[PDB]
């Protein structure tokens, strides 16, 4: 099973946020470290994506675009999986050095978005998601958000997305209900990503007022690509009609 060999081989390892756990759990300190984590993870997501089967057949401009649109969903989904494996159902394992308890969820001012992420994390348990299913679903998430006006080569994108969907099907077949369940879970990622897109955008705009630092790559993607999602120029592809 070449496809699963590849997905297991390229899966990124542990990334630390570099958070100073010695300081108080302030809004500014927590969100600055989440931003730093995001910047560090993005480096890993790019290297991961470029090594996926068939990814290099996209036009190079579309390679950059799909990563810049899908990162939030991808990172939230991977975070749910590691939370599921590592911490209890009340906590979120963003990184080994940045674990949110209930107090930090409140102080981050993201309590309601955190509730949704905890629920996503728990679904991995409720649905008994295997590591193989997790890997195939995470790969599909990279191909689940695109411009309404289309990518440079929309045709190659649609064929690649089709091949990832068939891969998920094959992994299940080793049923109809299972495919239904997994596609419903994938769709559930998108409304969570949208709330976080909204939150991070609003925060970048007032970042100097509230003393939150945004690293360079994050500030660029949040001011350039995230507003296209929020204005509806780039939209998630749902399996089921929303
Ligand atoms: C993707 C990250 C960081 C990586 C991860 O584990 C998931 C997590 C989800 C919340 C994001 C965060 C990056 C920084 C963001 C975008 C903040 O600006 C507000 C919400 C944060």
Swiss-Prot record:
Impact after mutating residue 54 to D: In AIS and prostate cancer
Annotated effect of mutating residue 121 to P: In prostate cancer and AIS
Effect on the protein upon substituting residue 84 to L: In PAIS and prostate cancer
Outcome of substituting residue 51 to T: In prostate cancer; somatic mutation
Reported effect, residue 79 to V: In PAIS and AIS
Modified residues annotated as Phosphotyrosine in this record: 238
Annotated spans, Interaction with LPXN: 1-241
Mutagenesis / variant outcome for changing residue 80 to D: In AIS; loss of androgen binding
Phenotypic consequence of residue 33 to G: In PAIS and AIS
Outcome reported for the amino acid change (mutating residue 80 to S): In prostate cancer
Further remarks about this protein from its record: In the absence of ligand, steroid hormone receptors are thought to be weakly associated with nuclear components; hormone binding greatly increases receptor affinity. The hormone-receptor complex appears to recognize discrete DNA sequences upstream of transcriptional start sites.
Role played: Steroid hormone receptors are ligand-activated transcription factors that regulate eukaryotic gene expression and affect cellular proliferation and differentiation in target tissues. Transcription factor activity is modulated by bound coactivator and corepressor proteins like ZBTB7A that recruits NCOR1 and NCOR2 to the androgen response elements/ARE on target genes, negatively regulating androgen receptor signaling and androgen-induced cell proliferation. Transcription activation is also down-regulated by NR0B2. Activated, but not phosphorylated, by HIPK3 and ZIPK/DAPK3.
Protein name: Androgen receptor
Annotated source species: Homo sapiens
Included range, full protein: 672 to 920 of 920
